[PDB]
């Protein structure tokens, strides 16, 4: 239960370093979804990000693995969470 509050992510987007050399932008285009665009990885290889959603409607955190190429997008439901963190899987 650490991260940025989802309420602080807007349609404009915010950029994160998930782990060394791996950068992504998160956008919140509606209150139910989080859109992740992969921006850069070491060697431009497929990412290996762990997304952790917590708080809010969630009594316990939920995690999702995101393995996508730079330039690709992953949409995920936020499940009423308050908080999100990006880490290395």
Which residue is listed with tokens 């997304």?
A: 51
Tokens of 28: 């919140």
CB 86 within 8 A of CB 64: no
CA distances from 50 to 9, 12, 63, 70 (A): 18, 22, 7, 16
Tokens of 60: 């316990």
Q: Which residues pair with 16 in a beta bridge?
A: 24
CA distance 41 to 61: 26
Taking the alpha carbons of 12, 85, 59, 74 in that order, is the dihedral positive or negative? positive
- Which DSSP state fits 47? P
> Nearest 5°: CA angle at 82, between 79 and 84?
85
- The angstrom resolution of this structure is 1.3
Kindly give the residue spans of alpha helices, DSSP state H, lying in the chain.
none
CA distance 70 to 68: 7
Q: Which residues pair with 33 in a beta bridge?
A: 30, 77
Beta strands in the chain (DSSP E): 4-5, 14-19, 22-30, 33-40, 49-54, 62-66, 73-77, 83-88
**Residue 62 backbone dihedrals phi, psi, to 5 degrees:** -125, 145
Q: Where are the domains of the chain?
A: 4-88
Q: Which CATH class is domain 4-88?
A: mainly beta
């Amino acid at each position: 239960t650490s991260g940025i509050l989802l309420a602080s992510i807007t349609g404009a987007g915010s950029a994160f370093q998930a782990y060394a050399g791996c950068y992504l932008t998160a956008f919140r285009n509606d209150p139910r979804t989080l859109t992740l665009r992969m921006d850069k990885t070491r060697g431009e290889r497929i990412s290996n990000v762990l997304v952790i959603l917590s708080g809010g409607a969630l009594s316990h955190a939920v995690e999702e693995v995101v393995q996508i190429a730079p330039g690709a997008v992953r949409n995920l439901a936020t499940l009423g969470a308050s908080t999100v963190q990006f880490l290395h899987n």
